[PDB]
Chains A and B, each alone.
With several copies, the nearest count.
Chain A
Amino acid sequence: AIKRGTVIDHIPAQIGFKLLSLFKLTETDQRITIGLNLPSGEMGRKDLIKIENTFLSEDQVDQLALYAPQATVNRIDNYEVVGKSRPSLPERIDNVLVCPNSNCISHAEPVSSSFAVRKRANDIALKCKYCEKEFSHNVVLAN
């Protein structure tokens, strides 16, 4: 158990390591604990990331809803969970994604990528601000 910081729980197997990379989580001096392929009651196998004295940026929380929808973000102070929730899905995602339309202007020019995210069971939809094309987030994750 940790005193203060974040525990990202119920991460799908083979996703925990990806999160470490993308959110640059290990680029800190703060103590970190990681469990990969842990046994899970509701999931069977899970990944788990603990980061002391550290909280996810608003950006990272938004990005988490895409990569790991059913994951659990626990906020912790004085050894207690003072905040527990799945990451709130945003309607817009900037910077991190790459439009799969190869003739999109956003590849050649100094602008930040931007997608209108639309939760759409099953696959969540991403519409590019520039080319106006829409894609499954399964396809957009091919950055």
Chain B
Amino acid sequence: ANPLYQKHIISINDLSRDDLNLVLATAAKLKANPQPELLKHKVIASCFFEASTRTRLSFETSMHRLGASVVGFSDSANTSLGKKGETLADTISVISTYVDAIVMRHPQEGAARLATEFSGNVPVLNAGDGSNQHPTQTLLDLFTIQETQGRLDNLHVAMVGDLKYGRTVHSLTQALAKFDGNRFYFIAPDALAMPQYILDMLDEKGIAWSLHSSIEEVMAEVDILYMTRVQKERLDPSEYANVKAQFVLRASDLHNAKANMKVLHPLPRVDEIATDVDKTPHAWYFQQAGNGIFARQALLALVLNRDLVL
């Protein structure tokens, strides 16, 4: 079996560089040569306990592109967890008797991990758990950085906005740290800084990083400017000073950007990226979102099909 066959995909911290590269190689192959019947006869649960547009719809689209069927819900309000008091554990215990894999997003950190403890032999794929991890975002992110930069090592990567609550940057930083020679710039309000457990991991690996108070400081050297939304639904009321985006990127801020530089954003954006950026050649967040199909097709294929695709 391929190394990812029947594996839970919960946290980037659980995966190796080899795993990440395997997903990307598989993504490239399926994009070049679709296999519309690869997951024929699979039925996969798509269980979203908090809001989503991109992650849920690209995941479901990917299931259909591979010929799998889909059941689930886009909110918990009309599940028996929503109305009859059922625990998440019992919810997973029954759903895992129906389906071949479970894709889940949940507002509490650790929900996907918990699900793995009740899902028996049914793989759980974390579409996001509170402010913790977002591994499939990282997979499509890596695919996009690779496509646009030609490599995943020796890159200058700035991450901007809400780093404390961004499950996206937690996962992406851990992932890029598994490659060699990448350098990080963290541009965040002090209250929403990158968590210490991430910084420690960088230190331990001898990876260079620094804090910056402006985007312009680093614009001239960045290969990837990864913008983020303030996760207002996760903030303590004590942190409401930071609801408004502190860093707004406009087309004019891109004067000294390298030619190769791409602006990424896991989306949705509020105002942290002005619409005038959209037409510039550095804007790549919609392209990034479209890459979710290839990354998520690849992951489902690898988890649910024992042989490597060709």
Contact = CB atoms under 8 A, between A and B. Distances in A.
Contacts of A133: 109, 132, 195, 197
Contacts of B109: 101, 103-105, 130-133
A125 B196 CA distance: 11
Interface stretch (A7-15, A72-80, A107-115): A107-115
B243 interface: no
B307 to A, nearest CB: 31
B270 interface: no
20 contacts: A101-B109, A103-B109, A103-B131, A105-B108, A105-B114, A105-B130, A106-B110, A108-B87, A109-B114, A111-B117, A129-B113, A130-B110, A131-B108, A131-B132, A132-B13, A132-B110, A132-B197, A133-B132, A133-B195, A134-B196
Given A127-B197, A131-B132, A105 B13 contact: no
A105 B112 CA distance: 9
Given A127-B197, A132-B11, A110 B113 contact: no
B106 interface: yes
B147 interface: no
A104 B110 contact: yes
Given A130-B110, A130-B113, A109 B133 contact: no
User: Of A106, A111, A120, A125, which is in contact with the most chain B CB atoms at under 10 Å from its CB?
Assistant: A111
Interface residues of B, number: 25
Contacts of A134: 195-197, 200
Contacts of A111: 89, 114, 117
A128 interface: yes
Q: Is the interface of A mostly helix, strand, loop or mixed?
A: loop
A108 B11 CA distance: 21
B229 to A, nearest CB: 17
B88 interface: yes
Nearest to B278: A110
B131 A110 contact: no
Given A110-B87, A131-B130, A131-B132, A105 B197 contact: no
A130 B114 contact: yes
A129 B109 CA distance: 10
Interface string B192-224: 000111001000000000000000000000000
A108 B76 CA distance: 16
A105 B129 CA distance: 9
A71 B223 CA distance: 51
A108 B88 contact: yes
Interface residues of A, number: 19
Interface of A: 101, 103-106, 108-111, 120, 125, 127-134
A109 B13 contact: no
Contacts of A105: 88, 106, 108-111, 113-114, 129-130
Interface string B99-137: 000000011111101100100000000000111110000
Contacts of B197: 125, 127, 132-134
Interface string B1-35: 00000000001010000000000000000000000
Contacts of A128: 110
Given A104-B110, A105-B113, A130-B109, 12 more contacts: A103-B109, A105-B111, A108-B88, A109-B114, A110-B275, A111-B89, A128-B110, A132-B197, A133-B132, A133-B197, A134-B195, A134-B196
B166 to A, nearest CB: 14
B133 A108 contact: no
Nearest to B195: A133
A104 B195 CA distance: 16
A61 to B, nearest CB: 26
B54 to A, nearest CB: 19
Contacts of A120: 200
Given A130-B114, A131-B132, A134-B197, A110 B108 contact: no
A131 B275 CA distance: 23
B196 A108 contact: no
A125 B133 CA distance: 20
